[PDB]
Amino acid sequence: CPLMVKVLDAVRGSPAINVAVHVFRKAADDTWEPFASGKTSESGELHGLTTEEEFVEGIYKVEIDTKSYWKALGISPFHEHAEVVFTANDSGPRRYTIAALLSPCSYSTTAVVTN
Amino acid sequence: CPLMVKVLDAVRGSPAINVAVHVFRKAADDTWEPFASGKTSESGELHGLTTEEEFVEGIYKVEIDTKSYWKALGISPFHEHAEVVFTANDSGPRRYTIAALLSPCSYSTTAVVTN
């Protein structure tokens, strides 16, 4: 799979488990079209979102439902969700890992792109 | 001002200057309505986006145009922009500082909220 998502919890120092993730692809009319979704596993990872054939160049949005995650833990969060928007390119063969670190009032996201 | 945005550059270790910021509010019909916009100053801060009167309860989106910022420095970054989505003033009026820390392939954002 060319696309992977990894989510970490900065408060408990653990993978963020069972977090909902929705991926969208930008359509010709500039609206967001559902592309793939899933929930993070006990490793805080989400594999098998898509394949090489379907993952063509374009603009993608990864939406992480952080609000429901903090609500489950009884912690009041600031953000409705975390959004990561990027362009996928074919500048050679590549695997994309979208990593996110979550706190109730802060989040960080990083792209790890390897060949 | 109830809403302030502060942007830093993690590569140069300086404020991020002349960064475009657009703010939207979710309308009754569920679409994003333009709320305000501006550019960061020499100190990486954006003040005067709105007033107490105008800044009513609702869901807001702060979009920071990170791509244009990195491209003007010769760097092709990963993200199209950084988006911060939150509910504001749902327990009464508050002052919000949205801070963002930028790297070409990573960003973090934090909220500082005071009564």
Add this chain to the structure above:
Amino acid sequence: CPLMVKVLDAVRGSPAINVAVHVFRKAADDTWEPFASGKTSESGELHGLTTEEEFVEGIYKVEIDTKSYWKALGISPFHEHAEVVFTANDSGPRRYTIAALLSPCSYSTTAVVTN
């Protein structure tokens, strides 16, 4: 003041108040000599640590006592403290802002340096 420290809390989305900060300078004999210390104020800032005259070239260490901060909130954190080590004024005098963002199992620190 040439040296300023700013500390934020990622869990509460507020400045980190009453956090102890100790600053050390590397001496000729390679040991850490106490340089200054203080606690953050209501705004999470620590000013007046030193003056231009006293803040000469050298390697400095800023130690932020994060453990005591989290323990006073009922949280047992991961780190003993956050340490920031840097060479200062090796290309002439500068003004340094050391910012830190705290979570129980994570922290980030950034430097803002201006001429």
Add this chain to the structure above:
Amino acid sequence: CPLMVKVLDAVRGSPAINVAVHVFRKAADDTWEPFASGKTSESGELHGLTTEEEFVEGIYKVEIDTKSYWKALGISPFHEHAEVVFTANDSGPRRYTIAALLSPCSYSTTAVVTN
């Protein structure tokens, strides 16, 4: 191995490869005693630092030579190194992953502790 280190590069959006890492254990006299060292691999990971038998409760310091890393890339960095200091506990069986995200003027570190 109960202790692992993972290092990421926020500028290039890749693992930080061939980064030197030194681990120390706090001795009864409060000095830092060398414990283990190595260089990160092509995955930005460092495995096999120690074993269950030798990794007893105590205070450990992980030092990441970030300065040499940025120097190799021709980017001027702020910090001499990144330091992570923590207490290892036997609160049940556990594996520790110390993750770090690097920019020239900023770094973040997180502990991912799983069972």
